[model samples]
Target chain A: EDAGLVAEAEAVAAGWMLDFLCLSLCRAFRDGRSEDFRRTRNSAEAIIHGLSSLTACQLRTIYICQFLTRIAAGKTLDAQFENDERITPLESALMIWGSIEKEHDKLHEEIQNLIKIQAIAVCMENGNFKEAEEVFERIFMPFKSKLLMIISQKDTFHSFFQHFSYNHMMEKIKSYVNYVLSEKSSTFLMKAAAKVVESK
Target chain B: EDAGLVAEAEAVAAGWMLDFLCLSLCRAFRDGRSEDFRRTRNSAEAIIHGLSSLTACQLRTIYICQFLTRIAAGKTLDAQFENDERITPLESALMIWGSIEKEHDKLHEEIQNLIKIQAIAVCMENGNFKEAEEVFERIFMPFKSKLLMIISQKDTFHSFFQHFSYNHMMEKIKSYVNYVLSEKSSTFLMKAAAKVVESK
Candidate 1:
């Protein structure tokens, strides 16, 4: 019981420390001072070093999601991390998810959504529209239904898809559109449109 | 003459070191390894410290532009450098130009175009259609003539304006459009269109 209590306390501390570390990093990014960067890096190093023993468990938590969101925002200009292959947040997301042996049903869905969005982007970028559409409809679009309840009461599937197309997923979809139009790949267009109609 | 040689050597060394520093930081970010971050941070700290003696001419060269470009890309998620308060790449262009005693006549106009585009975005975001129109006509459109030679020989001013309207500057413009339509602000619409005509 004593050891269990200690382990629980440690997990709590690690969770909070992870949150603090990430927020500090986000703040440093926003502050844009070289000194802030240095300071935050030191803090990050310290936290990571301290968690060496618990690295596996510490990484596979909600903090990684928050960190992934920060990366998704794409607002930082820090050179140390800019083009670095080592600090990939998405890769870390998969690593953490993989490390989770038994998953919470809630986190499983959340992680799947995150991964599916990235997967769809990759599929689009690679000009694999069929696969992208399949993943988008099967995984990403359904998530929109849940979001619609909070996002807007009047939001239908069509409205939600339109909003998604024009806003968040526009860049990737437009890339696919450019590829399709420029390459005269009309079949994919028909396929995508047919899928939309079938869903309706 | 020997001292001049030494200074030249130092400048070259310093430039490379700065590049190395930036690259290392980028690597740490990509790697996302705690130890990698610490290592890169040390490299960065040393370079910054070394630059204190070489500050006068070091910050004003093409290297700074490269540095600015990396920041502008916003591809990294480094916390210390995340979405900080540093004036943006466009603002940096203006600041660097202002800091120069004599203008490179060619680069002057290029910088102005960059600044004007950014200024137009700001104006649109703030709903300052009058100022946005002024910038669009007086600065951004003129730059298109030069761009047209390389971008597309047949690209008309109207095409250029419309393309710019929908692409690079689309989000801000779309947001402004939504605001205007929702608020029934027809004057801004007419004013923007009138400027479009005047440019023609």
Candidate 2:
């Protein structure tokens, strides 16, 4: 019963702390006092802990936890040091970094999509021709991977893939076009990934 | 003279340590001990220190320094662990992470293309639809910033603009798309990027 009582008290405290944290963060943004907002981190931490035990069915609790960090760190960008212009630029950069991190967990698919493009450019500079070739091949691999991803939505991959070919000439035309309607998407798996992902 | 001497000594030592660290890391991989590889973290201070005096020429040095911690973490799930049953799971996961990282850095375009998608998803999730609608009067205003990431000399917005009927969508899309495309082409930047490039 002691554990239960403590849990109930913590749950209530956590809820109140969360609301306070959100309000403080909003005030920090409006007032441009990054320091005061930093103090609310304790409240954010408590809210995070309280929500950790929750399930997907309790969506708002989870969404609020995600929102608290995204807003306080990214949208709000910590007004803690607003009075100091010297600190503002640095804080802005930090704001970018923090926002990126918060966004990373929130929108994972978006991050991966960008990383793939970034990787291709790096491969080109290193004269990693093999990977370059692979990248050109795999850009539209998703549409073919699951027809469900395409037909469920018209003008989606149907157009995205067709244009991908025209955009990059010197690439094989017949094969590229044929590949679009084909069943399996091309695998750009490193010499290793092909073996690994294929095994399962 | 004292500062010059210190810089030279530091560069030489940095070179030696970096080579030694790479060798040790590779050996650890071969031996299948992810635990041992994780232990060599104090070395980050050395690389971070070199960052100050170094120019862009030393970009590789800068990148490798932080690559490990960013790429390999405790929570990393091996897409291969299910497939490579004979290998130690930790080692298999490490190998997979390393291999993907290598491929990712090399094929920079593919990475950014993914990042563009990632960024859109992130901005969308963080976007205050309620506020954006009431204030900005823009549909998908939360995602507008991310929609225009440029890829392969083509802006994501300009390329995708052809698909949508939004007013000035192409011109407005130019803002984000130019950055995405330019960002994707720059390999070093790709390594640093947190979001996506749009593909035509």
Candidate 3:
């Protein structure tokens, strides 16, 4: 029982570290700082390395979260290392897990949902509202009811959503509305309405 | 002179190319697409190299705009090439113009103001309101009175301010107000007042 408890604690720490690193990566990319790009990548590598020391039970959350980071960074597992004989850390992770372990398949599904949600945020930032709407309909709605259930199980998901909420994305839908609708009539009135609400 | 007219047309084309490339770099970085980063960097270099064929008169605008881009990219004129070439394009421009040729100093000053204004917009996007204010006060206010004059002369500054305005920054000042002030007495009442205005 103590071993299980220890694994849980380590899993929790790894989860938080993954969340912090992901947010830092997002901020650095947004700021266009190449130095930070290098820094955050180094930090991510270190945390992933540290996860290797933890028990397999403790490793699942970190592994999934780290995979999401790679996705977010536009990195692929096939990325080559300087040492020609070796595979990249991400490649190795895929090998070790056999791409998706049966035990962690449910967790992998949850991670996929979060990644799709993140895709929507990226589309929104790019003002690709059409793509965002398609992602919402195709990726988001199918899993909407299960989101809270998955969130309760994963600390990282809970924290990610806490910082960048579903409601926040819903608010961004208004930006799409402003883009698509007659701005002179609807957006102006909405802005006026928002101002009114703020006064209240 | 016909030579001068052609130079002017070439310079205008160069200016638009520089602006488009700069904005593309900004977008690629924001999207965290390393592939796009390499592509945009290549495009920028090709444009800069193409500028070499133009007359010195045409080169001035491209050189200045390119120099501003390097500054925005956190690159300096002291950058060395693989052959250990001492002078960058920016350095050579400064050498030829002799820091601030009386004839070109006015245009240089106008470019500097536009770059500083761009800096303010970047700071605002980062939500570094304090740094934005510092840049505004230290860099912007000194030339604030001459802003309209420069805007009239340059399409670049006109487009920039149209996107990120004094009114927009003033509205952002309200964000700072929310940060410093009590929500109940000030923000709440302000919202209520806006609501009343909308109703009326």
Residue-wise C-alpha lDDT for candidate 3, range B90-134, written one tens digit per residue? 233334334422344554445444444554554445455554455
Worst-scoring 10-residue span by lDDT in model 1 chain A: A184-193
Worst 10 residues of 3 chain B by lDDT: B180-189
What's the TM for model 1? Answer: 0.25
TM-score of each: 0.25, 0.21, 0.20
Give stretches of model 3 more than 4 Å off. A1-80, A83-200, B1-68, B71-109, B137-200
CA lDDT scores, all candidates in order:
0.40, 0.35, 0.41
* Complex DockQ per candidate: 0.01, 0.01, 0.01
- Angstrom error of the Cα, residue A1, model 1: value is 60
Interface RMSD, per-candidate values to 1 decimal = 24.1, 21.6, 21.9
Give lDDT tens digits, candidate 1, residues A1-200.
24334234333433343444344344333334446445544544443432435545355433443333433433233346525734333343444545554445654554444454454444444454554455445443566656434233322234433443324442432232243233322222123323444454
lDDT of 3 at A66: 50
lDDT of 3 by residue, A148-199 (tens): 3443343334555555554443344323223222322222222333344445
Per-residue lDDT of model 1, residues B1-200, tens digit only: 24334224333433443443343334333334446545435544444432445444345433433333432332232335324733333444445545644445654454444454554454444454554455445444566655434233332334434444424432432332243233322222123323444454
Q: Give me candidate 2's TM-score against the actual structure.
A: 0.21
Off by over 4 Å in 1: A1-200, B1-16, B21-50, B55-57, B61-89, B100-108, B122-200
